[PDB]
Every structure is written in C-alpha cells, then in structure tokens.
C-alpha cells in the first residue's frame, strides 16, 4: 500500500499517518518523547513528518529524505530510529543543536 518492504515505519511513533487532525487530539500537549508521524502534503520535502513536544515548547518536528532514507537525521544511510530507541534511550541528542533533545523512548504508539 505505502512502502511495505522499506524504511522502518515500525518504530511505534512511525505508526504511519495518524491523521493530522488526530495529531491534534493525539498529542495536543501530552509530554515530550511522545514522537509520532502523520505525513501529508509535505511529502516532496520530507521523509514522513513527525510530531513531538519540545519539552512542552512544541516546534513542529519532521523527518526529511535524502538518499532514499531520512535526511537531517544523518543522511548517510540511517533509516532505523529503533537501534537508538534501545541503544540511546536517554542522554539527549543536542548534538549541533537542541533541535529535538526531548527523548523518543515514549512513542504514542497509537494510543
């Protein structure tokens, strides 16, 4: 239907399109680490979007695409944000900037 054998699209938060609107009634402002994906219009310039709370700040969150896989998320060849879900599930990701650094070990996993 929509890329079956490709991309993780199984990292909980990567449920796969949760309906924008829903995203409003899904993580209106629950808590950080409440990753989630919805995807929509923004397809060309974006991997599969994403919704998360920047510690209650809320920015927008969204994944990009580069070489088939994600983008901003190190466009080297990383299309699995699960290895970290276990490998790095606490420590922050404020590498070059606190773009996210809000955790992601607590995916909405479709309430």
């Amino acid at each position: 239907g929509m890329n079956n054998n490709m991309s993780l699209q199984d990292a909980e938060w990567y449920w796969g399109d949760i309906s924008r609107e829903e995203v409003n009634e899904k993580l209106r402002d629950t808590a950080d680490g409440t990753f989630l994906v919805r995807d929509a219009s923004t397809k060309m310039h974006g991997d599969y979007t994403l919704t998360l709370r920047k510690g209650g700040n809320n920015k927008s969150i969204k994944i990009f695409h580069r070489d088939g896989k994600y983008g901003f998320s190190d466009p080297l060849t990383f299309n699995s944000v699960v290895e970290l879900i276990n490998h790095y599930r606490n420590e922050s990701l404020a590498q070059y900037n606190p773009k996210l650094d809000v955790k992601l070990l607590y995916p909405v996993s479709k309430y």
Binding site: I61, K62, F64, A94, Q95, K99
Partner: peptide, 15 residues
C-alpha cells in the same frame, strides 16, 4: 505549534 521541522539524527546520546 506542531508544524514540520527538519531535524532529528539518531539520539547517539549527548554529542
């Protein structure tokens, strides 16, 4: 808001 922001990168812990 909760629009769309390009950024992520494996947690890779702090730095």
């Amino acid at each position: 808001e909760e629009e769309y922001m390009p950024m992520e990168d494996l947690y890779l812990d702090i730095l």
